[PDB]
Amino acid sequence: FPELYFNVDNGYLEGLVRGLKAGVLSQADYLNLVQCETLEDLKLHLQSTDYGNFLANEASPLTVSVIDDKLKEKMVVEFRHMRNHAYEPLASFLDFITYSYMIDNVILLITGTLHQRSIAELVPKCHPLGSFEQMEAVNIAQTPAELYNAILVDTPLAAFFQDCISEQDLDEMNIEIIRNTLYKAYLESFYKFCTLLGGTTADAMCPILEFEADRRAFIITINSFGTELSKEDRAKLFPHCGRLYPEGLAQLARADDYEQVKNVADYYPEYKLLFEGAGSNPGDKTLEDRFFEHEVKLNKLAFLNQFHFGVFYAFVKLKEQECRNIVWIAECIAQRHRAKIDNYIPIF
Amino acid sequence: NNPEYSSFFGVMGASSAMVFSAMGAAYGTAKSGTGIAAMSVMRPELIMKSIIPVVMAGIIAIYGLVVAVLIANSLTDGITLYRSFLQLGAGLSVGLSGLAAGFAIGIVGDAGVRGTAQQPRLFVGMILILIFAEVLGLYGLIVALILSTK
Amino acid sequence: NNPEYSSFFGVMGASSAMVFSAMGAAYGTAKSGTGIAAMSVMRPELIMKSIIPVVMAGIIAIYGLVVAVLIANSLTDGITLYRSFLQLGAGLSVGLSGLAAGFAIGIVGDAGVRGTAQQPRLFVGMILILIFAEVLGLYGLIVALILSTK
Amino acid sequence: NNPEYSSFFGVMGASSAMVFSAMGAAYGTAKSGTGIAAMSVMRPELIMKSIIPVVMAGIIAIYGLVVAVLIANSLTDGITLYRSFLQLGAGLSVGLSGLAAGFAIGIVGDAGVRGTAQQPRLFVGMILILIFAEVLGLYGLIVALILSTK
Amino acid sequence: NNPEYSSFFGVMGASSAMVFSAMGAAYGTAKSGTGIAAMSVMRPELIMKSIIPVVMAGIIAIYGLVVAVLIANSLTDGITLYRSFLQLGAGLSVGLSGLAAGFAIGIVGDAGVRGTAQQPRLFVGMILILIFAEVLGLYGLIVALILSTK
Amino acid sequence: NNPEYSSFFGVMGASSAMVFSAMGAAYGTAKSGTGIAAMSVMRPELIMKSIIPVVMAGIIAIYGLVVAVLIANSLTDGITLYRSFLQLGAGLSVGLSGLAAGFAIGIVGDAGVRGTAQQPRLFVGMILILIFAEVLGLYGLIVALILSTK
Amino acid sequence: NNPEYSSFFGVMGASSAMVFSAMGAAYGTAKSGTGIAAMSVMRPELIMKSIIPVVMAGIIAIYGLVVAVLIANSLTDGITLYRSFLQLGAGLSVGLSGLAAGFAIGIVGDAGVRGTAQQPRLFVGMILILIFAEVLGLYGLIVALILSTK
Amino acid sequence: NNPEYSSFFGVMGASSAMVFSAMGAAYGTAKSGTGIAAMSVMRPELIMKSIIPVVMAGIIAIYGLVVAVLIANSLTDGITLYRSFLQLGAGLSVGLSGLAAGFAIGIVGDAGVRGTAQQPRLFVGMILILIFAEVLGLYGLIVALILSTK
Amino acid sequence: NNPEYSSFFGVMGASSAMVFSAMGAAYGTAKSGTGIAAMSVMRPELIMKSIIPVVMAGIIAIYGLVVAVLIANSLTDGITLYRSFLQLGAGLSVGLSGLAAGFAIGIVGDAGVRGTAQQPRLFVGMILILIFAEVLGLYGLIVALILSTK
Amino acid sequence: CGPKLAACGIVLSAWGVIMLIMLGIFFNVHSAVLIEDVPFTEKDFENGPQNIYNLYEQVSYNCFIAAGLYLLLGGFSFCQVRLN
Amino acid sequence: TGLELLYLGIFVAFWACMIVVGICYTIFDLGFRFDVAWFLTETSPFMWSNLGIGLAISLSVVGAAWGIYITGSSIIGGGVKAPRIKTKNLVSIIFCEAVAIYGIIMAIVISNMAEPFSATDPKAIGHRNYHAGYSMFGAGLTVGLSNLFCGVCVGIVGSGAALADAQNPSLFVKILIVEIFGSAIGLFGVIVAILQTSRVKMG
Amino acid sequence: LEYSVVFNLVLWIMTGLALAVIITSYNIWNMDPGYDSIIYR
Amino acid sequence: GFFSPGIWMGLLTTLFMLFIFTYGLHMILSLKTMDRFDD
Amino acid sequence: FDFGDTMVHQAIHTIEYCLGCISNTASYLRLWALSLAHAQLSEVLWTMVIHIGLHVRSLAGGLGLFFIFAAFATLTVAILLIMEGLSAFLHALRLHWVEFQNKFYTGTGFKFLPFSFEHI
């Protein structure tokens, strides 16, 4: 199936992103980084690999906050490059990666506008993977209703709002309900897109996107217990893609304690091993750490094919995890808290 | 006397009766078997009860067999051509009606099984709807019996 | 004398009456049966009222059965080619009209069942909507009865 | 007496018995063998139990082979055109029924094995549903044996 | 003597035996090779164990060659129309059976090696599923010999 | 003597030689052109080196022209079907080969240009990979010249 | 002796000459104009220089016109089929070559124009690549003149 | 003397002359008009200027009319196939060239209006680009005027 | 004198004039109505003005009626095959030109109605766009009246 | 062996003997329905029924021999089911 | 989507006609038309031959073209981050060229076996001439389509090797075995095409 | 005589015109009207 | 009949090279361009 | 009470009985259907298997017939004794559940549940 068309438009970008996939820190690379004693050594070790010169032309008194920014700067330049070079079948897929960041940027814009702040002050805080081309929303910024109309005109997000959130909803709902409701519409739409890109894309993407839908449902459930969210508000936010959708999604929505959530994970042996594999006790890996670990084990399956878009999405989420890893190593070193330095996730 | 090609249409009668019925029952079994497999995950109790659509889809294969055998055992070299057209008419009247019924059993069996996972009271409703699906094979059998013996 | 192929259009009449009506009843049953199953979780009490679209889909296959039987009863080897074209016209007339009525019953049933669960008032409307679908099988039948008796 | 071209249909029977059952058994092996591989990562114990869809897919190709050999042994340089059509019928009737059975074995095998990985109780139901799929090849074989020996 | 065009169908038999086996062995090798190569970065030792799906795809190319050689050496301008059709049948039978086998070998080869590199215990099961893909080529070969040698 | 239509095939040979080579050159120029544009924004100095896959796509149109002219000069009213079919064989052999080679040059151009932008070491390799695709055009031209002069 | 019908192929020459050239020039103008418009919000000063793609698309339609008119001005009653098929092959050979050239002009015009607004140095490259696109229309013309003057 | 059926091709000329030109002008008016309406949301004043792509799309319908009238007024009972083919050719050449023009008018009218909304300098470029789309209808017309009067 | 199987073309003209014009008016209504409904949500007062694209689509059906009635009263038993082709030409030329006007109306209606609610000035411009769609029907009427009375 | 194989051999022993002896009887009574099971040839229609009767004896012996293998499977399996 | 629904639309409309036509010529008693014996005699042997030759080149070149661009576009892409790719992986292109070479070898042979008849009646043309025409067709079609498939395969698995080599230098040497098995398909498409041609003579 | 010629001329011209109508009709029937500033409202 | 030599051979060429043209036109109509460029 | 719901229920019941007098009357053809299938399967399963052991000599046939009959037993069990049995079982249940019971058995109520130590 895919080989009739895939290399016609994507063969170069596939070879490029696979090149960037060779350019990753192995377990053996992390087992160098964690041995060193200061950010000057961290620079000198990272200097030996694809991160070379990421801290060039920068202040000698390094801070973990500068390392964080320059790690992301590499990732976002590589992504913007692949998005500029891609043709519409892939480029629409790469756009689907960027919505997961534009949602969070829109949450800042709505938050500042609801507090009457000028959006021009929020621009430097927006994630580079979600920066807009059209700016009249940013330039005008006058009221939440004006921003909502400007979003529908300017932003690719406009379709998601029309499916789930009116202007009147934006005036009343909390911004974190907005974040997850937009995300619900997003993940389901992107999963539908990946089911329409049948064969190798669908078979690489659906295991990941179905896991992300389950992951939101599990995590939102255990986080909701201490909160004003009703069982109906949980049900309104769980994404309908994941293996739980036929029943476990409703069972989570009814659930109100960790054991009742494990009673859903017990029906799905992957998830049973994730919850069994973390009590979140002192010195344990946490439930969250197992979700990040498993998401990496799924993203590692993307490169076991040759002709599909699953590599681009998995690559972004792996380099994102590489940034989170190197920042977490840099914190443990800078603060001397070596006792938890091993908690990075071994990407490849 | 009777045309040399005549038995070709009678053969396509028998063949269609079995072939399109096997496609109908295969679709019925594939879609409902998928629904059972997905439903079983959180329902060890319902796995046996849920076989209803699967076995019912098998009936369409048997209506196809009945007509196919009934035609096939009625073939001869001398066949009057009129009898061969009756046998085509029969073999399609069951065969494609069994395809229709198999579609309905497949879709209904899948949905009915998943809905029964969510709500065990649906088990009766599923049986009733599957009857209104399955009878489309039976009406195709009736017409094909009438035609294959007119 | 009448051409020996003349019965072919007659048996295709009987086949088309059955087959396309079963296709319509199957689609009308499959969509509405999905609607019932997916509805059952939120409103388990509505299953027994919600069968009506399924029953009306089943009725479309009965319209095809009736005409396929009437056609079959009227066949003979010596049939004048005129009467065999009438039987084809009757067959397609009920058969494809029942396909159309079945398409409508499927869409109306799925929307009608899922709507009714959120708002019971819809029922009084959707039964009348379903009547205005099912009557297409009746018009296809009326034409097919006229044609198959000229 | 008999057309020289007559054996062409009987050869297409022998061919189609094997061809369409090979397609059916290939798809049945391809679809279910994808599922077995995906499953085995989580449940290394279930590999030997999960082979059964593939074994039944092999059996559909055996029904193909049976008729294909039975026809190819029956063919001759002057075969009566009647028997040549009966052989085409046997070939299609096992072959496409084998295809349908292979589709069912494929879909049911994949769904059944993945579901079994999540629920070991499904294994019983999966085998039963797989027999209801695989028997569609056997029903095609019945009609094909009848037609080829009639 | 024989008709003037007689050898054409037998030539299409020799071509179809190769062409559809090149389609089958190509897809079977191409899909398997993408699996082998993409897999090998994760497990550089497992290439040798993982070549076997490609060797199976080469074996179904041999089946197409063996039949196409036998047809091509049996052909002559003097060939009777009967053996020209048997050879067409042998050619479609091996060719499309090798196609089916190759399609299966490609799917189960790729899924098999990808599974194996995550969970090495799959290998023993992968060999068995590949045998049940490749043996469809052998049933294609058996039929095609029994036709073309008659 | 010769048929009234005989010259038509040789005329379609002359046309196909140009038309399919123009299609191959057009795609090869369109993809390389798009590559150049989206490279030049970042590496303006590489335009004059990177036009290479465009001139090579242009050369695949020339290969079609050479044959199209050589066929057109060889035509006459009285042309025997032999010479007219040789010219049609020439027309495909250059034309569709140019269509093929042109697609490889277009895609390898679009990759090769956007690669060279990031990696100056590619510029030799890209031209080796493109010269293989241009020789595919010669493997059309060479036989089309041989056929036209026969 | 000259048959009836013969002027049809020569007319479809004069049609295809114009029609497929107008389609080439329309696509070439449509993509180029999209490029100019979507570009010229940012760089209005580049509107005039960026017309060149559109002018070369216009030239492809002129090559279509020239051949169509040359054929039309040499159609005659009772034309031999030889000259008439030459006129067909000429009209396709410009028309479809100009179609291909038009796709190249369109794609290169759109990529080159929107690229040039980011990077002025691209302009000289774009003109050269547009010449390698536009000349395909001239090759279609040279072959069409040659064929239409035999 | 001359055949019946002769008028058919000339009538398909008058039909194609009008139908494909109206399709062209309809696409050009549709795509341009949706552009104008969408544009007016931002710009209240540009409507009476931005109409011009619709007016040039209107001209394409007049080219179809002119040829369709000339064809329709030329046809008679006794007409030779030669003048009839010329009338088919004319009607196709204006028809499909007016379609090609209309396709380009729609795309460049829409893009030109949208760019003009953000940047008023584009209007001059939009008119020039549009003349190079509109003239394709005129080339279609010129060929069709020649052919229909040859 | 005149053949039978001859009034058929003029009858398909009478039908086509109405059928394609009804399809044109139906698309022209279906989009325009979706526009009017979606628009009315925020600007209820505009309905009695924004109906115009629907009224224009209604006139396209009337152009079909006028030609279909004209042909239906112009037919006679044994009509000269020449006039039967002219009426087929008329019946396609109004029918499909009405269909083209219907497509244009449907698009500019759905855009222009939405646009008019966001931009109250647009309404005059929208009518001046719609006139250039509706006149495609009138051009199709003109040629169809010429042909059907030629 | 294990108990599973012994239980299989018990059931197979019982059903194999029961059926094969009934066939051996039906062959020895020369019943008309059984003809299709007999491996006769064109020469077996010469002289009279003596040739076909000899084949009914040979085929009856095939079934008695096969039933003997099922009795041996029985005795073995009735030991193994107790031993395992 | 669009062109797949057009190809399917034509394909279904075609077979919907062919079912009806095949029924009609059976039931109306018109088996004296649908004379396949007429089609296979009056269609000139030179047409079957020259489609065979033309497809023997062109389909081989189509397979070698996909062969080249599937491996080539991966060679280029990996080559950015791994310059070592741009030499060793070229062997996969050489095997794609070898699939075209197998085309031209076979098609020159078949071409250089064609000769003119000097006759136009199926009796006078006779079995040898027909068998040459049909054999050169099937042979040329068999090398053409077998090379079409072989070249696409070697392309695919050449991207195989290249994208793997980009991540580990050692892999290419071992992965190269699949390219050999791919390349054998085109060679089988020659061996049989020689045999299908090997006994013909026109005159 | 020439019935195959008339028939193939009519059949292939009407196939070509039926496709060029159907394809053009499809392209015009299913254009994106693209009214982006209002399509979301 | 519905066919004659020059027509049947004409179609077995034309309804072949029109398949080839559609493969050509599928690849050419598959041509696209990027909506973006680098900084 | 509601006259509307009373008409809905009584119409559904009347329609199910009236249409049942077509469909349910025909439904018992299932018996013939499966019976034929069972008979065919049994004849094929004999014919394709047992005849391999039916060699022209006592010893040479009887030795093969042991293993050939074991394959025959295995297949006749899995297909007939297991699955077609399970088919007939489930079909006959359906015949009870609807075509029989729908005349008289409402089949609506709570299951009685005795409290007991037996549930431990």
UniProtKB/Swiss-Prot annotation, chains B, C, D, E, F, G, H, I:
BP terms from Gene Ontology: negative regulation of autophagic cell death; positive regulation of ERK1 and ERK2 cascade; positive regulation of Wnt signaling pathway; synaptic vesicle lumen acidification
Annotated membrane topology: Multi-pass membrane protein
Principal location listed in the UniProt entry: membrane
Keyword set includes Amino-acid biosynthesis: no
Annotated transmembrane regions: 6-28, 51-71, 88-109, 127-147
InterPro entries for the chain: ATPase_proteolipid_c-like_dom, ATPase_proteolipid_csu, ATPase_proteolipid_su_C_euk, F/V-ATP_Csub_sf
All ranges on the Lumenal side of the membrane: 72-87, 148-150
GO molecular function, one term: proton-transporting ATPase activity, rotational mechanism
Tissues expressing the protein: Expressed in brain (at protein level).
Assembly mode: V-ATPase is a heteromultimeric enzyme made up of two complexes: the ATP-hydrolytic V1 complex and the proton translocation V0 complex. The V1 complex consists of three catalytic AB heterodimers that form a heterohexamer, three peripheral stalks each consisting of EG heterodimers, one central rotor including subunits D and F, and the regulatory subunits C and H. The proton translocation complex V0 consists of the proton transport subunit a, a ring of proteolipid subunits c9c'', rotary subunit d, subunits e and f, and the accessory subunits ATP6AP1/Ac45 and ATP6AP2/PRR.
Alphabetical list of Gene3D superfamilies matching this protein: lithium bound rotor ring of v- atpase
Key words, A-Z: Cytoplasmic vesicle, Hydrogen ion transport, Ion transport, Membrane, Synapse, Transmembrane, Transmembrane helix, Transport, Ubl conjugation
Cytoplasmic topology ranges: 29-50, 110-126
Record site: Essential for proton translocation: 134
UniProtKB/Swiss-Prot annotation, chain L:
Cytoplasmic-side segments: 24-41
Source species taxonomy: Eukaryota, Metazoa, Chordata, Craniata, Vertebrata
Coiled coil regions in record: none
UniProt name for this protein: Renin receptor cytoplasmic fragment
Membrane-spanning intervals of the chain: 3-23
From Swiss-Prot, chain M:
Transmembrane segments: 1-21
Subcellular location(s) of the protein: Endoplasmic reticulum membrane; Endoplasmic reticulum-Golgi intermediate compartment membrane; Cytoplasmic vesicle, Secretory vesicle, Synaptic vesicle membrane; Cytoplasmic vesicle, Clathrin-coated vesicle membrane
Post-translational modifications reported in the UniProt record: N-glycosylated.
Tissue: Expressed in brain (at protein level).
Membrane topology, Cytoplasmic segments: 22-39
Subunit structure and binding partners: Accessory component of the multisubunit proton-transporting vacuolar (V)-ATPase protein pump. Interacts (via N-terminus) with ATP6AP2 (via N-terminus). Interacts with RNASEK. Interacts with TMEM106B (via C-terminus).
Annotated function: Accessory subunit of the proton-transporting vacuolar (V)-ATPase protein pump, which is required for luminal acidification of secretory vesicles. Guides the V-type ATPase into specialized subcellular compartments, such as neuroendocrine regulated secretory vesicles or the ruffled border of the osteoclast, thereby regulating its activity. Involved in membrane trafficking and Ca(2+)-dependent membrane fusion. May play a role in the assembly of the V-type ATPase complex.
Family membership noted in the UniProt record: Belongs to the vacuolar ATPase subunit S1 family.
Protein name: V-type proton ATPase subunit S1
Organism: Rattus norvegicus (Rat)
Phylogenetic lineage: Eukaryota, Metazoa, Chordata, Craniata, Vertebrata
Gene assigned in the entry: Atp6ap1
Whole-protein residues included: 413 to 451 of 463
Curated annotation (Swiss-Prot), chain N:
Ranges in the topological domain labelled Cytoplasmic: 100-120
Family according to the record: Belongs to the V-ATPase 116 kDa subunit family.
Protein name per its UniProtKB record: V-type proton ATPase 116 kDa subunit a 1
Self-association and partners: V-ATPase is a heteromultimeric enzyme made up of two complexes: the ATP-hydrolytic V1 complex and the proton translocation V0 complex. The V1 complex consists of three catalytic AB heterodimers that form a heterohexamer, three peripheral stalks each consisting of EG heterodimers, one central rotor including subunits D and F, and the regulatory subunits C and H. The proton translocation complex V0 consists of the proton transport subunit a, a ring of proteolipid subunits c9c'', rotary subunit d, subunits e and f, and the accessory subunits ATP6AP1/Ac45 and ATP6AP2/PRR. Interacts with SPAAR.
Vacuolar side, ranges: 40-60
The gene coding this protein: Atp6v0a1
Residue stretches spanning the membrane: 15-39, 61-99
Species per Swiss-Prot/TrEMBL record: Rattus norvegicus
